[PDB]
Amino acid sequence: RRRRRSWYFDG
Amino acid sequence: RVSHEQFRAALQLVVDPGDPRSYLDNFIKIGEGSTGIVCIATVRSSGKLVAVKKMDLRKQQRRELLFNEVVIMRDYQHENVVEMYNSYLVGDELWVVMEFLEGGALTDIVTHTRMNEEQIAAVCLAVLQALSVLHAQGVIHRDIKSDSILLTHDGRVKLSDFGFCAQVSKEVPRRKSLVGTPYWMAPELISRLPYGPEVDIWSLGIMVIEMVDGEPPYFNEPPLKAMKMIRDNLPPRLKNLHKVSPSLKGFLDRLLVRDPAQRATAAELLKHPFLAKAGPPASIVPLMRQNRTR
Secondary structure (H helix, E strand, O other): OOOOOOEEEEO | OOOHHHHHHHHHHHOOOOOHHHOEEEEEEEEEOOOOEEEEEEEOOOOOEEEEEEEEHHHOOOOHHHHHHHHHHHHOOOOOEOOEEEEEEEOOEEEEEEEOOOOEEHHHHHOOOOOOHHHHHHHHHHHHHHHHHHHHOOEEOOOOOHHHEEEOOOOOEEEOOOOOOEEOOOOOOOEOOEEEOHHHOOHHHHOOOOEOOHHHHHHHHHHHHHHHHOOOOOOOOOHHHHHHHHHHOOOOOOOOHHHOOHHHHHHHHHHOOOOOOOOOOHHHHOOOHHHHHOOOHHHOHHHOHHHOOO
């Protein structure tokens, strides 16, 4: 998807 | 999980008191960031530009990250790490006032032009120097990619964007949290296993692929699909493998190692002879948008 965003998925 | 009120109170003890709108004016939005927005502003007294990151305390999945960014910026300074001047709370926003770096981000270079190996080695060397110092103190950046590499007007590297960082200790030596940017994530991290500073080394390898190829591996796949391939497959190959030296391929082979226990450390990599190729800061300058032709 060519997205460069940083993401928090789970602890 | 502590209340908003208690989190804000904790954060308030570590930031500078006051309202930064007393000092800064002429705000101009420059971007959507990793936990908020980024602006430039002029400091009233000097007319000098600064960058200001604004993060809403109430809209964070992991608020602790706000606290981490401030404390690591305050306590772990390095010549190759972006400098935080001040931080403030303005209502339910955290504002972090940063130096403005006139060279912009490495992303802009890797997507518009082709770096040579001396330039690639210069960037790696500088990132590794920062990481060696940070890793020695248990700090993990967790979001290494070209977007997090900023450049001064004279071509010096500054690791930036600590919004996702963590610190491990003797007491809590590993993290388990699935955080970062899908295409750059280490296989152990995607696997939700206990991990440490090694994740940054993998991510740096993917950034090397960016510097050679222009994009990370699997960039056209949905993020969760790319993450499955990094997790399950042999390490990603350079698409432009045919263009690269033995020294670079040998170097990259020490970063893109699936077992973190076998992966090189930053301290080991500082002695890899690929980095003997590094040009000076003058070598990066001509790559920057403000100097580019075409």
